[PDB]
Design a protein around this ligand. Structure first.
Ligand SMILES: CC(C)=CCC/C(C)=C/CC/C(C)=C/CC/C(C)=C/CC/C(C)=C/CC/C(C)=C/CC/C(C)=C/CC/C(C)=C/Cc1ccccc1O
Ligand SMILES: CC(C)=CCC/C(C)=C/CC/C(C)=C/CC/C(C)=C/CC/C(C)=C/CC/C(C)=C/CC/C(C)=C/CC/C(C)=C/Cc1ccccc1O
Lengths: 169, 169
């Protein structure tokens, strides 16, 4: 079935974390994004996913740091107001889904794989059908032209994802 | 040594997640908190921790839902503008710390245990000493008089914590 990510009720989250000086985890989120996805429990190879993110909506709960994350030193949102992820391959791996796709971030497109898992699906208390998932992945900062070094412990960023979809059609 | 949680550079996060209809994970965060902590790597029994959280600063990236979280139906911030955590016992459990303490949430004080771990410690690029930790815990909603039911899969909330301290004295 085809699904629409629940942006209206915001039961979708694109979070992330990366170490700070190798001393602690720095958490953040991208508050403005949307997307769709096809989920067929019997035929996993037919699954799809297409999401758009407005990178300017990054939030790590610090005005100054975020102003810096939007700068040309990092996300460079003025030049690339958007990050985008489109699947190219999906394959069932036991009780999980390995989602391979093209990530266009900071001007560069490179394939990244996410490990997703069905949390639950079923009826809506309002007459709709839903399906939610949790996912993980990593992004090597250098691969997407983000040169500003953050230390040996901070070369890649952990992606903590969770989306609830509303069945379409 | 005594530490002051880095609220200035906000290298501290009090996050949480709970399921939505057993379909997906709903993430949130408390943007306004402060605190201190004593860390002695050799004598873990002397460790302390005291944090204050302005519950009104809750954020799940949805204005409506958050207005509801502040309401009498949940956090009841108008009556109780603050949550508070004071350790009462700390003991080394192998390579981690089990921090027991009193949590005053929504008017009720009950002991909750956190499982923390040292991420790293060392010198500052600015001449200070730091030590960061990651921690986990669970809060049973009913225990703290948060009656409004969210379903069988949503009885307790996952606490995802990370704090970096700046050595005092
Ligand atoms: C097919 C099917 C059935 C589907 C199931 C449903 C699913 C699971 C579909 C997937 C859904 C979604 C939304 C998938 C999204 C996938 C992807 C790959 C999204 C891309 C997200 C994205 C925009 C990546 C950006 C991540 C990055 C690079 C974050 C920046 C982190 C960063 C630099 C932090 C800086 C850290 C640091 C120590 C800064 C120091 C610092 C600087 C200045 C002042 C103070 C200070 O402390
Ligand atoms: C000792 C030493 C060396 C220290 C190491 C360093 C450490 C690790 C020190 C600890 C540092 C800190 C900060 C420790 C903090 C500890 C604690 C226990 C903090 C308490 C935090 C707190 C305020 C708890 C609140 C959690 C709660 C109850 C969240 C509420 C969310 C809730 C009910 C969820 C809504 C879910 C739901 C399905 C909503 C319904 C709904 C309504 C409307 C629209 C949409 C919708 O979905």
């Amino acid at each position: 079935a085809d699904y629409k990510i629940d942006k209206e009720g915001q039961h979708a989250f694109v979070n992330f974390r990366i170490q700070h000086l190798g001393y602690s985890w720095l958490y953040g989120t991208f508050k403005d994004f949307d997307g769709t996805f096809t989920f067929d429990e019997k035929n996993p190879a037919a699954d799809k996913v297409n999401v758009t993110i407005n990178t300017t909506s990054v939030d790590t709960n610090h005005a100054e740091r975020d102003k810096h994350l939007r700068s040309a030193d990092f996300l460079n949102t003025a030049k690339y107001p958007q990050a985008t992820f489109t699947s190219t391959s999906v394959k069932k791996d036991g009780d999980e889904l390995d989602i391979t796709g093209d990530l266009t971030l900071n001007g560069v497109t490179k394939p990244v794989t996410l490990e997703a898992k069905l949390i639950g699906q079923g009826d809506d208390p309002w007459g709709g059908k839903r399906a939610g998932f949790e996912a993980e992945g990593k992004i090597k900062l250098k691969d997407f032209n983000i040169k500003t070094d953050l230390g040996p412990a901070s070369q890649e960023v952990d992606l903590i994802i969770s989306v609830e979809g509303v069945q379409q059609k």
